[PDB]
């Protein structure tokens, strides 16, 4: 049952904004390691005395990296006169956020028909306001509400590139890197209690519901905005990875971004080539027993040679009644064992492909326990 | 005149420690962009609950990158029980430092015969103490005094790899990157007033003295520890780049690290190939007039083909009475227009090569003004 109960018209994931200590170095690392392109900037060179913000792009995926300058550069300004390109920015909030959680996602940003209506409707249905609707250069409206922890859901709407006050970087400083990543598939939040977190977000949005954790997934009408949310399952054998997150993150926050790749084989080859020269490390591979068993589960979908490629790259494979999902997980993206990244590609549900085709991999919890189980042998 | 008036036995530059928001991402960026090797770590995986520290190595050059974890991980510890591998570390100091100056150098570290004697003698000659002498695992003594701003001069001495509590990373996570950089040549500080800064550092060390600034250089007995210090020259046409530093840095701090390369041509080729894919940008090239004139200044030293290579890479060339210096400068290393890096190679003063052979490039201020001067033409 898809009740399509959204309370305002949501379109797509628009961007993810990281709050940094130093935006430059995270942006350069992420660019090289994910093959994302340096496409826009707002900083000193464009007259922003408040924050440094650098946008990376791959396909439809937009990663924004932001850090505060010294307040002494903008102590004279007031909000009416600000040189900030992003009006919700605040030195104190950014410094507090970062020193509390370390590097991670401040904003999950979705495009909507009308940011102002979306904010108003959201607040009227219980959303905590974070930044009111502000209109940028008669062209873009942006507003923010609290999602979970210090992560805000940012609404973005356009009259008719990224934001006013941002510049395009010309092709010379912009190396056309591309490892095949094309859009944001879903963003996952870790929370102390699932129940209330769900009730809060589905309450103001209208989104419907799509070892060591329970998890539910909230989705927009066409199910292209997918927001899973985890809670820890306490008391079990191995410590819950969700609780580990909450302890190292200092509370709730975004756990991982799933990035869709048009060719997860090329993406993972390119990313793995670069792991140890500035890129991202991947999580430990599953035992070969997992790939032996892959023929039984997915034989009618991937050839032996394709499945062979999966085991070279450590790619995981799940499937449900509608479709089949390929996935792999990076090790943490920075100092703390908190936020990480998933690479996914989905096979099926063709009509365009329906969002979430094949699920999110919960079968792979089971397939991995049993995987080692025989591997031990 | 070299009075060799050091007050304690100094050996070599030992390492440079960056204080980060996120040590991982700076360390990965610096590794790829400078071709430095991931050689040691102290962090959660080695039982440090206090800070994350990652050591990069190229030749004798050691870059250390450190960031604080959440205090909630070590709130139970006290200094006697600390899991920190670096005893001078302090969450509050690191967070304060970084939120004040942004990414930059916390510690210029030199090896000495006896860190404790060096600290004691230094304090008795006016040094401000920052961290007392602490002995690590009956093997290493480390102590810190204030150098300028929030930059400390760290003394390091060994009974007989980097530090106790650090692990070597095994060759698999350690890609043997190498672009030819071999040791730290000098570290330069920007200060509001040169006079008092000089008097303070030469006072406690015994080091002797070797447009828009005045600058003097302090040096150890064998002149292998070189510590230049700049002050702004106010009132001139173009704004002083030193004052710009002080305003964006929130006061005094380290301006640049000069890294000696055994083959500055290979280094700069490798670095430039990577500028726009995660590496470092370089400062604007000088006009060809500069390279036309190079034959007149340095014709008896570099061939036409070698000089040709210089103009491909934007390498600058200076020389004094003793030797000849090749140099180039990176754009800032992070968000703020503060700290940058110089690549140098020195020709001459062979006896081993004497430190500082050929100077530091002050002639190149003159050669560049006159360079454009005709270039404009
Ligand atoms: C990297 C770490 C520490 C854990 C991640 N992880 C694995 O390591 C191997 S199995 C695995 C299977 C699925 C997922 C996943 O993406 C998902 C959730 O689990 C909740 C529902 C929504 C959702 O998106 C993550 C997995
Ligand atoms: C990148 C920026 C903004 C300025 C740097 N710079 C140039 O840009 C071109 S000329 C130039 C020549 C020499 C030096 C230098 O290294 C030096 C000092 O100046 C003081 C004495 C000690 C010392 O080490 C730096 C230069
Ligand atoms: Co997922
Ligand atoms: Co220099």
mmCIF file of N, CA and C and ligand atoms in Angstrom, chain B residues 186 188 213 215 228 230 241 256 283 327 329 340 342 360-362 364-365 368, ligand 2:
data_model
loop_
_atom_site.group_PDB
_atom_site.id
_atom_site.type_symbol
_atom_site.label_atom_id
_atom_site.label_comp_id
_atom_site.label_asym_id
_atom_site.label_seq_id
_atom_site.Cartn_x
_atom_site.Cartn_y
_atom_site.Cartn_z
ATOM 1 N N UNK B 186 63.070 24.748 6.305
ATOM 2 C CA UNK B 186 62.863 25.808 7.275
ATOM 3 C C UNK B 186 61.366 26.028 7.470
ATOM 4 N N UNK B 188 58.625 29.083 8.741
ATOM 5 C CA UNK B 188 58.585 30.543 8.792
ATOM 6 C C UNK B 188 57.369 31.009 9.575
ATOM 7 N N UNK B 213 57.221 43.438 3.902
ATOM 8 C CA UNK B 213 57.681 42.681 5.060
ATOM 9 C C UNK B 213 59.120 43.068 5.376
ATOM 10 N N UNK B 215 62.189 40.743 7.523
ATOM 11 C CA UNK B 215 62.361 39.353 7.908
ATOM 12 C C UNK B 215 63.786 39.115 8.371
ATOM 13 N N UNK B 228 62.944 31.350 10.072
ATOM 14 C CA UNK B 228 62.686 32.738 9.685
ATOM 15 C C UNK B 228 61.412 33.242 10.350
ATOM 16 N N UNK B 230 58.675 36.757 9.974
ATOM 17 C CA UNK B 230 58.281 37.948 9.241
ATOM 18 C C UNK B 230 57.432 38.868 10.107
ATOM 19 N N UNK B 241 51.143 41.173 2.574
ATOM 20 C CA UNK B 241 50.680 39.801 2.703
ATOM 21 C C UNK B 241 50.862 39.271 4.126
ATOM 22 N N UNK B 256 54.764 29.385 6.518
ATOM 23 C CA UNK B 256 55.019 28.345 5.531
ATOM 24 C C UNK B 256 56.136 27.409 5.958
ATOM 25 N N UNK B 283 50.956 28.855 -6.669
ATOM 26 C CA UNK B 283 50.804 30.279 -6.891
ATOM 27 C C UNK B 283 50.999 30.598 -8.375
ATOM 28 N N UNK B 327 63.040 27.448 -6.093
ATOM 29 C CA UNK B 327 61.913 27.488 -5.170
ATOM 30 C C UNK B 327 60.607 27.720 -5.915
ATOM 31 N N UNK B 329 56.077 28.103 -4.710
ATOM 32 C CA UNK B 329 55.149 28.264 -3.595
ATOM 33 C C UNK B 329 53.765 27.767 -3.961
ATOM 34 N N UNK B 340 50.993 28.216 3.775
ATOM 35 C CA UNK B 340 51.273 27.645 2.475
ATOM 36 C C UNK B 340 52.573 26.860 2.572
ATOM 37 N N UNK B 342 56.378 25.728 0.510
ATOM 38 C CA UNK B 342 57.406 26.033 -0.475
ATOM 39 C C UNK B 342 58.149 24.743 -0.783
ATOM 40 N N UNK B 360 67.122 32.463 0.941
ATOM 41 C CA UNK B 360 65.711 32.123 1.052
ATOM 42 C C UNK B 360 64.862 32.764 -0.027
ATOM 43 N N UNK B 361 65.468 33.505 -0.952
ATOM 44 C CA UNK B 361 64.784 34.024 -2.110
ATOM 45 C C UNK B 361 64.503 35.504 -2.082
ATOM 46 N N UNK B 362 65.113 36.265 -1.172
ATOM 47 C CA UNK B 362 64.720 37.665 -1.058
ATOM 48 C C UNK B 362 65.051 38.435 -2.328
ATOM 49 N N UNK B 364 64.307 37.440 -5.161
ATOM 50 C CA UNK B 364 63.199 37.183 -6.071
ATOM 51 C C UNK B 364 62.050 38.172 -5.905
ATOM 52 N N UNK B 365 61.912 38.815 -4.742
ATOM 53 C CA UNK B 365 61.021 39.966 -4.669
ATOM 54 C C UNK B 365 61.415 41.002 -5.720
ATOM 55 N N UNK B 368 60.963 39.830 -9.467
ATOM 56 C CA UNK B 368 59.595 39.709 -9.954
ATOM 57 C C UNK B 368 58.990 41.067 -10.292
HETATM 58 C C1 LIG C 2 53.553 32.899 -1.504
HETATM 59 C C2 LIG C 2 53.578 34.329 -0.956
HETATM 60 C C3 LIG C 2 52.277 35.120 -0.837
HETATM 61 C C4 LIG C 2 54.715 34.891 -0.590
HETATM 62 C C5 LIG C 2 56.009 34.097 -0.718
HETATM 63 N N1 LIG C 2 56.895 34.460 -1.827
HETATM 64 C C6 LIG C 2 56.376 34.713 -3.177
HETATM 65 O O1 LIG C 2 55.212 34.673 -3.412
HETATM 66 C C7 LIG C 2 57.268 35.062 -4.364
HETATM 67 S S1 LIG C 2 58.839 35.787 -3.839
HETATM 68 C C8 LIG C 2 59.299 35.008 -2.270
HETATM 69 C C9 LIG C 2 60.657 34.992 -1.949
HETATM 70 C C10 LIG C 2 61.078 34.404 -0.762
HETATM 71 C C11 LIG C 2 60.098 33.856 0.049
HETATM 72 C C12 LIG C 2 60.490 33.172 1.359
HETATM 73 O O2 LIG C 2 60.420 31.983 1.393
HETATM 74 C C13 LIG C 2 60.977 33.924 2.602
HETATM 75 C C14 LIG C 2 60.506 35.115 2.943
HETATM 76 O O3 LIG C 2 59.881 35.945 2.002
HETATM 77 C C15 LIG C 2 61.076 35.799 4.185
HETATM 78 C C16 LIG C 2 62.516 35.372 4.413
HETATM 79 C C17 LIG C 2 62.561 33.887 4.706
HETATM 80 C C18 LIG C 2 61.746 33.128 3.667
HETATM 81 O O4 LIG C 2 61.717 31.939 3.698
HETATM 82 C C19 LIG C 2 58.748 33.876 -0.266
HETATM 83 C C20 LIG C 2 58.315 34.454 -1.448
#
